[PDB]
Design a protein around this ligand. Structure first.
Ligand SMILES: [Mg+2]
Length: 1199
């Protein structure tokens, strides 16, 4: 009978088919069946311990000054926080205190019976693992939710102190209590093993020794509660925080749930895909994308059901680790929720929201104790609609036991404010439906049947009440103020009435038009990147950040309560917790806005990597409503994100310090002679190295390529370092040399334009390696390229940018001064610009129209200046057109040009391996002869190339040259060309020699191809024109150089260069820093140099020798430790440090060319953690930078 297997099910907690089946064994007896199930119930447990128990809680209790902590494990998050699992792990914590139990086995078997009294009721491997206890004079404890627990005994302190040092251990994981506790053997050998780390690298004993130890000193220092900067005052270690207060800590004990256990990683997608790999062996894009989630008990089959849905909906219909399947009416994305917290994170971050859960319980057992914890997770995230699937029903012969389980779950729902009476509950098997069984097949379709109707359609984005995050405001002359944005939702039809609400008293206005770059429309449609014309509203009555919304739609607020996830260390978030007074920025779709946050009832600290519900109160209002995502930002970097739940009702730095630094900074450091040249020699001397004798030498010294690695790295830094110093007096040297050079660039280029049209050797015998490769080249080339540049790719890849155009100058470089002022044009190229004009309603003016560019002079070395090209600005628009397609294409040859990392890497392989060589090319971009050009190019190309090319050039000297080269460096494509031209050329040498074409990788005149290929590439290059650098091409050294990394037998031997005469503090602060990077092995000096560094650091204004920043945060300060910074004030939990900026007066942008720039972009952007998505690219502001400096406060973290 059914009505009586419920009295036995509601007194045990065990299963429903373990209640009706153990009841037929007691012939029908109540206390009989319960006792039989008892003993037959520890086989369940034993059957369980074959699963990994990873989650679970931690518990702590202290008696006067005797405390204890034990972590009891489960296998699921949800369980760890259930009604019952707390009652058990709380009793095994209370009886561990009184009856004090250090030895673990004691209570594991003293409870062992009541431990199978859970595994039975719940069905999770629950093993009360390790326990210990500590006692001191005053011993305190800290508890972070329940995932991690600290036990700290400190003989000599009060209560506020241990609470806080419990929290510092809680969030810092010190392994030892002091830097001496170090296993005197674990240290007598990790120093005798790191003593090679540098002793092999060639360093002389006493350096490796001192180095290993300075290192080993920190190795310890940091991992020890002594040398661990306190977590609420990082500017001082707990070492001094402890000695400064009366105390000392006798010991500490920190357990974190799950530590040590592996728990192999799970992948819901392939796991359901490979599960149905057994049963797989038997115009309409407008459909809504409703995603769902399966939530429930680990092995009640959320996974075997999520399989049946997919195959059964496969033989019945059409088509962030989310599996997906189809229905006639809509498209579904399914996700599993094996973790309460782990879910929250995904829903806050936006990696997967949810429209409708699907609680999967198995009717074999009915609801579990912790199925309320499931319904919970769903109530909290506020999932609108839940549907329950009752699984494995074939195994209930009695049909009244089903409307019983239904009964049980149908109320668990309504204890949690879901329509527990009215909700769909389908009864079927997830597995019988896998075996192609029609009667249990259609119960699956029965669920996907409910997917269609009960989980309501999400409101389409273009259906909501119009909104557009204003990203910029221009004052167009003759056309009235205008904003540019992307319409978030809704529609705006030219002539309707909008509001501009957010940061300032909400204002209103009216739409006077809608236009793109190409076509001018009359309405904006959600999803589009449009600009919107207004009237009766000036351009300083608007700010990037407020929204353009239909009136009443949305209102500005300053106080709201939200729930955010703050990023872990790994995820590039904070590496340091924060507390009561967090004062960050909160990025809202388009702009940072500072705020102040108040934790909830109980949380006092927050750690990098946990979730949180908090009350954000910003400085000024912002337009919003619930469902809106906001990034949590810190001086530029995201360290969190979070969503908005309820809109509550909304109620340091210095004078002469910011200014005391400013002075310093501006001061001119001063010295007799060549400062740089001395900082050199004193470093040469520091390393035992006969110093430079005359300025003459700094640049005429040639390394030796033997010595140990160390014996080189120095000698190398010695040859290089000074090389590019612009200020050497000693020198009949000029830039007249520079043109003398560029003048044979032609004289050569000619000869090769000549050579390259005439090879018919009077006979048939002669076959030369040149002809051949250019022949393979042409073919290879064409295969990759196309017959001629499509237009589809000409219009996304054309763009303005950079600085100098024949019309604009360095100062008017920004792309808006290219749309602002009318730009030159080669005769030929004209058409293109007309074709552009023919495609926008804005007026693509052109200024003059010459075949002329400007040849010029830019300092580069000491022994020569550099020749470059300032092109017609409309040519360049288009020269970067094909530039960017020669880019996209060169990828099929494995060449990426955005990435000079996959070209230094190999430089280093070659220095150990000796197989790849590095070549280096002299007259690079300045020798690609027109001859060679067409020989290799589809002519469809070689034309659109001769078009955009600049043909003649205008010198400084007033004189002219007409070009022998097809391009000079600075031509909008002269890069992606020479790359492809050299790549093909090598890739063809490769074939001629049976070497892998796959081995040639390139970037500029920096080529890497296999070492044997090199001697041909020499004759092959000799022929086509290029004059190769025998000196800087290494096909056999211990040494390769490529893309700014140099290498010696696999170590880095790159130098750094002293480019300018050093006279500013910003100037020295640099050099000292690059000497810092060049000689540190992770914060740890090499003595030989730490001497010369220190010395010269004393040339600085005082305040400036102690002002230090981490690494890769600038050169506006000395790289060093930021906790030692005296000026560094920790505001609002975020450590703002001060650095030297370059000083810049504001200038006025062309509101139109700045506007055209903005909208051409929306176009180009239209023709192209998980949190970059709530982020933009920003408006245009100008400035000419004075020689003066300035001091900016930024945002830091200690490492
Ligand atoms: Mg190079």
């Amino acid at each position: 009978t059914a009505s009586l297997v419920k009295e036995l099910r509601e007194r045990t907690g065990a299963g429903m088919m373990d209640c009706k089946k153990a009841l037929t064994e007691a012939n029908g007896d109540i206390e009989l069946a319960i006792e039989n199930m008892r003993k037959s119930g520890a086989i369940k447990a034993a059957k369980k311990a074959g699963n990994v128990a990873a989650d679970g809680v931690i518990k702590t209790k202290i008696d006067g000054n005797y405390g204890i902590i034990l972590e009891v494990n489960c296998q699921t998050d949800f369980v760890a926080k259930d009604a019952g699992f707390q009652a058990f792990a709380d009793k095994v914590l209370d009886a561990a205190v009184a009856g004090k139990i250090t030895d673990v086995e004691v209570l594991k078997a003293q409870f062992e019976e009541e431990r199978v009294a859970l595994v039975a009721k719940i069905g999770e491997n629950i093993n009360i693992r390790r326990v210990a206890a500590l006692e001191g004079d005053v011993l305190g404890s800290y508890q972070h939710g329940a995932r991690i627990g600290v036990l700290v005994a400190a003989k000599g302190a009060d209560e506020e102190l241990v609470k806080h040092i419990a929290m510092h251990v809680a969030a810092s994981k010190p392994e030892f209590i002091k830097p001496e506790d170090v296993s005197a053997e674990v240290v007598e050998k990790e120093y005798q093993v790191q003593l090679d780390i540098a002793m092999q690298s060639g360093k002389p004993k006493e350096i490796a020794e001192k180095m290993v130890e300075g290192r080993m000193k920190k190795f310890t220092g940091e991992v020890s509660l002594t040398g661990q900067p306190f977590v609420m005052e990082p500017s001082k270690t707990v070492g001094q925080l402890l000695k400064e207060h009366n105390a000392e800590v006798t010991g500490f004990i920190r357990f974190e749930v799950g530590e040590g256990i592996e728990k192999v990683e799970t992948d819901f997608a392939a796991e359901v895909a490979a599960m149905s790999k057994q049963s797989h062996m038997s115009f309409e894009r407008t459909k809504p994308h409703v995603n769902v989630g399966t939530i429930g008990h680990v092995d009640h089959g959320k996974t075997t059901l999520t399989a049946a849905i997919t195959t059964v909906l496969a033989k019945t219909y059409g088509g962030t680790s989310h599996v997906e399947y189809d229905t006639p009416t809509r498209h579904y994305a399914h996700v599993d929720c094996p973790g309460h917290a782990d879910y929250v994170k995904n829903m806050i971050t936006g990696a997967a929201q949810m429209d409708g859960a699907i609680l999967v319980v198995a009717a074999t057992d009915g609801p579990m104790p912790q199925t309320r914890e499931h319904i919970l997770l769903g109530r909290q995230v506020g999932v609108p609609y839940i549907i329950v699937f009752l699984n494995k029903c074939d195994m209930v012969d009695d049909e009244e036991l089903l409307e019983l389980v239904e009964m049980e779950v149908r109320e668990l729902l309504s204890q949690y404010d879901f329509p527990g009476d009215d909700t769909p509950i389908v009864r079927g098997s997830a597995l019988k439906a896998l075996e192609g069984d029609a009667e249990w097949e259609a119960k699956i379709l029965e669920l996907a049947g409910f997917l269609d109707s009960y989980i309501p359609e999400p409101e389409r984005a273009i259906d909501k009440p119009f909104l557009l995050p204003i990203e910029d405001v221009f004052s167009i002359s003759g056309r009235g103020t205008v904003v540019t944005g992307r319409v978030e939702r809704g529609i705006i039809k030219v002539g309707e009435e909008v509001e501009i609400v957010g940061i300032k008293e909400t204002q209103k206005s009216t739409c006077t038009g809608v236009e793109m770059f190409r076509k001018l429309l009359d309405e904006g449609r959600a999803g589009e990147n449009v600009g919107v014309l207004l009237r009766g509203i000036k351009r300083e009555e608007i700010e990037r950040g407020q929204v353009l919304a239909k009136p009443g739609t949305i209102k500005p607020h300053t106080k709201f309560e939200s729930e955010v996830y703050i990023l872990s260390k790994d995820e590039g978030g904070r590496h340091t917790p924060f507390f009561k007074g967090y004062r960050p920025q909160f990025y809202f779709r388009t702009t940072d806005v500072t705020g102040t946050i108040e934790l909830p009832e109980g949380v006092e600290m927050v750690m990098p990597g946990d979730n949180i519900k908090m009350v954000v109160t910003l400085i000024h209002p912002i337009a919003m409503d619930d469902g809106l995502r906001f990034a949590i930002r810190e001086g530029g970097r995201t360290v969190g994100a979070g969503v908005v739940a309820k809109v509550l009702s909304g109620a340091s730095s210095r004078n002469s310090l910011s200014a005391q630094l400013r002075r310093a900074a501006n001061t001119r450091i001063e010295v007799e002679g060549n400062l740089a040249l001395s900082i050199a020699n004193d470093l040469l001397l520091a390393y035992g190295q006969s110093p430079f004798n005359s300025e003459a030498e700094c640049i005429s010294f040639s390394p030796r390529f033997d010595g140990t690695p160390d014996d080189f790295r120095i000698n190398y830094l010695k040859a290089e370092i000074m090389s590019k110093y612009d200020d050497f007096s000693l020198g009949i040297d000029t830039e007249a040399v520079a043109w003398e050079k560029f003048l044979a660039a032609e004289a050569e280029c000619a000869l090769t334009n000549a050579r390259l049209y005439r090879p018919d050797y009077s006979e048939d015998f002669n076959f030369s390696l040149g002809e051949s490769c250019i022949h393979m080249a042409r073919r290879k080339i064409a295969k990759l390229i196309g017959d001629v540049p499509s237009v589809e790719g000409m219009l996304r890849h054309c763009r303005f940018s950079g600085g100098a155009t024949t019309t604009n100058n360095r100062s008017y470089g920004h792309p808006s001064f290219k749309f602002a002022l009318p730009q030159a044009c080669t005769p030929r190229a004209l058409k293109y610009v007309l074709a552009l004009r023919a495609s926008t309603h804005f007026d693509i003016r052109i200024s003059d129209i010459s075949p002329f560019n400007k040849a010029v002079t830019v300092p580069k070395n000491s022994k020569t200046d550099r020749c470059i090209a300032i092109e017609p600005g409309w040519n360049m628009f288009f020269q970067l057109g094909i530039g960017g397609i020669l880019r996209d294409r060169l990828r099929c040859w494995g060449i990426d040009l955005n990435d000079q990392t996959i070209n230094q890497r190999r430089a280093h392989e070659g220095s150990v391996t000796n197989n790849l060589a590095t070549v280096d090319l002299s007259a690079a971009s300045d020798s690609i002869s027109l001859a060679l050009c067409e020989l290799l190019l589809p002519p469809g190309w070689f034309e659109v190339l001769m078009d955009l090319r600049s043909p003649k050039g205008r010198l400084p000297d007033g004189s002219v040259v007409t070009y022998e080269k097809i391009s000079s460096m600075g031509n909008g494509y002269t890069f992606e060309l020479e790359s492809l031209i050299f790549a093909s050329l090598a890739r063809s040498v490769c074939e001629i020699l049976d070497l892998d074409s796959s081995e040639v990788t390139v970037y500029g005149d920096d080529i890497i191809l296999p070492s044997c290929a090199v001697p041909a590439l020499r004759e092959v290059f000799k022929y086509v024109g290029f004059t190769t650098n025998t000196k800087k091409t290494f096909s056999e050294g211990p040494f390769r150089e490529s893309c700014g990394k140099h290498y010696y037998s696999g170590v880095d031997v790159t130098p750094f260069y002293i480019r300018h005469r050093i006279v500013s503090p910003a100037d020295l602060i640099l050099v000292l820093n690059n000497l810092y990077r060049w000689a540190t092995i992770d914060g740890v000096w090499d003595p030989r140099a730490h001497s010369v560094y220190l010395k010269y650091r004393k040339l600085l204004p005082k305040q400036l020798q102690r002002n230090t920043i981490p690494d890769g945060y600038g050169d506006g300060a000395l790289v060093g430790s930021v906790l030692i910074n005296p000026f560094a004030k920790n505001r609002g939990w975020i450590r703002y440090v001060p650095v030297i900026t370059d000083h810049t007066r504001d200038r006025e942008r062309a509101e139109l060319g700045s506007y055209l720039y903005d909208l051409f972009s929306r176009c180009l952007s239209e023709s192209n953690a998980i949190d970059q998505l709530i982020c933009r690219s920003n408006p245009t502001k100008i400035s000419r930078s004075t020689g003066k400096f300035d001091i900016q406060y930024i945002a830091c973290s200690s490492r």
